[PDB]
Design a protein around this nucleic acid. Structure first.
Ligand SMILES: [Mg+2]
Length: 164
RNA sequence: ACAUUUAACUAAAACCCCUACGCAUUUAUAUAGAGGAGACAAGUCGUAAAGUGUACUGGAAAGUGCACUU
């Protein structure tokens, strides 16, 4: 797959219409080797439904796409990155579903098909979650998803979904 | 534990005890499994008020609390 080039920091600064490098208020992992490492540690994703959060520039997104994922659902809150994610989607037809929304409220139990929903006592249900979010958002999210596991609802309606 | 016999008109003969050491003790090797250090990985890799210590941290790219230094 011929994916478009990864944005540089100058291109990111222009994209946020910020015109400077000091007021980013955000840190980007623009090194594809570390993102490749992270996706490797996420497990074998060949033909796996991956729900990715906090894409931003899209290093994790490109790394996941390079793995033979079946469908990749992406949720982005900043609309300014949606153009880049859209070009990335055009590069990979039918393997990227972008959604503009907030991960603390987005409802994943309806995103993927119902044929995926495996029992709790069987193996994890081929659905993986990967995320590099702001640290101010990852802890409410993990608390919320722990509550979901305790209730066996939300992303864990499919079974014992693994998170990275 | 165990015990002085014969013999002695030259002088000699005889002698023979019974008790472990083991699921004890020392060190070493082999084996399941787990954990460390080394090579700043080399590129046909990518690019352009502050500080120190300590305590909590569940909206932690660091914050707040206390004490310090310039
Ligand atoms: Mg706090």
């Amino acid at each position: 797959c011929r994916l478009p080039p990864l944005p540089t920091i100058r291109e990111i600064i222009k994209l946020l219409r910020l015109q400077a490098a000091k007021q980013l208020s955000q840190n980007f992992l623009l090194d594809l080797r570390l993102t490749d490492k992270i996706v490797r540690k996420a497990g074998n994703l060949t033909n796996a439904y991956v729900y990715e959060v906090g894409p931003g520039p899209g290093g994790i997104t490109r790394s996941i796409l390079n793995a033979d994922v079946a469908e990749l659902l992406v949720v982005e809150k900043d609309t300014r990155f949606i153009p880049g994610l859209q070009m990335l989607s055009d590069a990979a037809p039918g393997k990227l579903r972008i959604v503009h929304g907030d991960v603390l409220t987005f409802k994943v139990e309806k995103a993927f098909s119902e044929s995926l929903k495996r029992p709790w006592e069987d193996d994890p249900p081929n659905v993986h979650i990967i995320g590099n979010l702001p640290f101010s958002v990852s802890t409410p999210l993990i608390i919320k998803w722990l509550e979901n596991i305790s209730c066996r609802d939300g992303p864990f309606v499919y079974g014992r979904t693994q998170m990275t």
